Design a protein around this ligand. Structure first.
Ligand SMILES: Nc1ncnc2c1ncn2[C@@H]1O[C@H](COP(=O)(O)OP(=O)(O)OP(=O)(O)O)[C@@H](O)[C@H]1O
Lengths: 304, 159, 130
């Protein structure tokens, strides 16, 4: 605090942190001291060290049952480091832990913006099977639907279909002036570079989401139809399909010269195709046979 | 070290060639820094010769490579990163600033022509994988190359 | 009697540390990085008081303690008193922490210097077990 510290002074305390971890056990005060240096490490600008010392904090968890409530307020410092560079998914599960601080509140504005902060990262996170059941835990809550933008958010997820992206900007472009709560848009659009990266992120998510229904419904499509469907040039569609094909999330062959493009159908020349298809379909009426049998058997014994 | 150089000109064995440079660095360690900093260039480059860029980052991430980190280890990491990303434009952009470290390569023609012959199909596997039927003229615009040698290289890929 | 024996002070406190301290305080050792010593040796009669001192350590620290005279490992046929050292160590792993006495370790510690007879060989065999 004397010289306000710098890259070197913050490094002097670094090597001294772990000296007393194994020396003695201190419940509260030590924890408060061990989080003091990373908030200076943000000013050091060196992140690779900040994540190491932050990796020493997780082995101290779970810190609950002591403090309660202060250390729950420190997660607000950790999300700052995780949200910064490479991971949008690392804040996903941790913002549900920063959602436990307004649980004790006794506060409305902080809590009301906690809900939007926890609900809006679904788009920023790349789609995964863990995300699917993640959003279902928060859905159905009694406090969550209080936000009208939440109904738009949910509408894009449930059963997909299609929507105009500019009309999406009609709902999400008002939230900058709207509020009440401007904090989520303060994180997104606060930095011009951050906001632009999440604009291209939202675009990547909606165009990736339009694709996965096309993957189930094709069969085939004309190339020029996908351009007017996604409201972008065919060159942009080429870029998009290049990243989707290298992600090998869905196999496709999209011919540009002849205009015929399609996702799947999988080849399956002979064996497995006819096997599973023909046989299981035939077993349908076979296993259902005995099922309706007893249905008529009970109906005829009810009246006779 | 010399065993490594001769094996690099022989090109017969690309495995033990990395072993010799590794042991040589173990000798140069803790005594002479100038030999230790120049020893990593050959081992990592020979691992790029083996077309395994993923292990390069793992070697430079250890505590032993952090003390010896410098302007050369970033030139090794950028070749590993361009081979992993499979982009010749990034490779050439970084090739100008690191040319000072590229001149120390005893043979600049071998490694660069073999890597170019490699990155050719590493750029082709991105354009070919999405669709089977492809025109030559529009796909040659991505790699920015005449269609003649391209068709020659593709037919070679069939062979 | 641990007070009655008089000396030797630095030996008394020394075995108190290396014997008793790993039991109660493994933390002090595991912090510095040092592995706790598992064994010790006493020898008289340059002086004497061996079985006294160590005896009052067994009846002092209490906890779990095991008494061994070197003459009970004789066993006659089939030196399975070796497997009694194995099984004995297993029950020392049962009642652990435990302490082991060893009185008159010269005979059960011999050198097998000159190859000879049978007894020395099977004794050396139980020593291989130890
Ligand atoms: N420092 C001492 N304080 C009290 N008594 C002692 C001391 N040293 C020896 N003695 C006495 O010696 C007797 C035998 O105990 P001790 O353990 O010394 O036998 P020992 O060392 O096996 O004998 P030796 O080594 O001669 O075979 C005990 O009755 C004890 O009173």
């Amino acid at each position: 605090k004397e010289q306000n510290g710098d890259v070197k002074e913050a490094a002097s305390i670094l090597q001294e942190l772990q000296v007393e971890t194994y020396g003695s056990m201190e419940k509260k005060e030590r924890v408060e001291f061990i989080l003091e240096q990373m908030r200076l490490c943000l000013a050091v600008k060196d992140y690779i060290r900040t994540q190491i010392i932050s990796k020493k904090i997780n082995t101290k968890f779970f810190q609950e049952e002591n403090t309660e409530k202060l250390k729950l307020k420190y997660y607000n410092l950790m999300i700052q480091l995780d949200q910064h560079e490479g991971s949008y998914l690392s804040i996903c599960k941790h913002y549900r832990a920063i959602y436990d601080t307004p649980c004790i509140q006794a506060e409305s504005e902080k809590w009301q913006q906690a809900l939007k902060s926890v609900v809006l990262y679904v788009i920023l996170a790349p789609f995964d099977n863990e995300q699917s059941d993640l959003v279902h835990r928060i859905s159905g809550d009694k406090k969550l639907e209080e936000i009208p933008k939440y109904k738009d958010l949910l509408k894009l997820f449930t059963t997909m279909e299609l929507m105009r992206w500019s009309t999406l900007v009609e709902d999400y472009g008002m939230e900058l002036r709207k509020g009440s709560l401007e904090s989520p848009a303060t994180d997104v659009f606060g930095s011009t570079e951050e906001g632009e990266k999440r604009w291209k992120d939202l675009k990547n998510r909606v165009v990736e989401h339009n694709i996965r229904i096309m993957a189930k419904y094709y069969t085939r499509i004309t190339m020029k139809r996908m351009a007017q469907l996604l409201d972008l040039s065919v060159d942009e569609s080429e870029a998009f399909l290049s990243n989707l094909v290298v992600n090998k999330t869905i196999f496709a062959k999209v011919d540009r010269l002849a205009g015929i493009i399609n996702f799947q159908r999988p080849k399956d020349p002979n064996n497995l195709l006819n096997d599973w298809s023909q046989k299981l379909n035939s077993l349908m009426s076979l296993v259902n046979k005995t099922t309706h049998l007893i249905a008529k058997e009970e109906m005829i014994h009810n009246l006779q | 070290m010399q065993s490594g150089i001769i094996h690099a000109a022989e090109e017969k064995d690309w495995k033990t060639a990395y072993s010799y440079f590794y042991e040589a660095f173990e000798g140069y360690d803790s005594i002479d820094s100038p030999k230790a900093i120049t020893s990593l260039k050959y081992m990592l480059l020979c691992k790029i010769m083996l077309n395994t860029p993923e292990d390069v980052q793992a070697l430079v991430s250890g505590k032993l490579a952090l003390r010896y980190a410098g302007r050369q280890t970033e030139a090794l990491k950028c070749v590993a990163q361009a081979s992993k990303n499979r982009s010749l434009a990034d490779f050439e952009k970084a090739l100008t600033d690191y040319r000072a470290e590229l001149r120390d390569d005893p043979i600049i023609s071998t490694h660069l022509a073999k890597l170019y012959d490699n990155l050719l199909e590493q750029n082709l596997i991105r354009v070919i994988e999405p669709f089977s039927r492809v025109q030559i003229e529009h796909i040659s615009s991505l790699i920015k190359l005449s269609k003649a040698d391209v068709e020659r290289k593709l037919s070679q890929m069939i062979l | 009697s641990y007070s009655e024996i008089g000396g030797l002070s630095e030996q008394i406190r020394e075995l108190r540390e290396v014997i008793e301290l790993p039991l109660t305080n493994p933390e002090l050792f595991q912090r510095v990085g040092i592995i706790p010593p598992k064994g010790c040796l006493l020898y008289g009669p340059p002086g004497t008081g061996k079985t006294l001192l160590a005896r009052a350590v067994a009846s002092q620290l209490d906890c779990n303690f095991l008494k061994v005279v070197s003459s009970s490992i004789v066993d006659k046929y089939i030196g399975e008193s070796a497997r009694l050292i194995r099984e004995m160590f297993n029950y020392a792993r049962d009642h652990q922490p435990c302490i082991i006495f060893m009185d008159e370790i010269d005979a059960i510690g011999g050198r097998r210097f000159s190859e000879g007879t049978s007894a020395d060989r099977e004794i050396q065999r139980t020593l291989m077990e130890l």
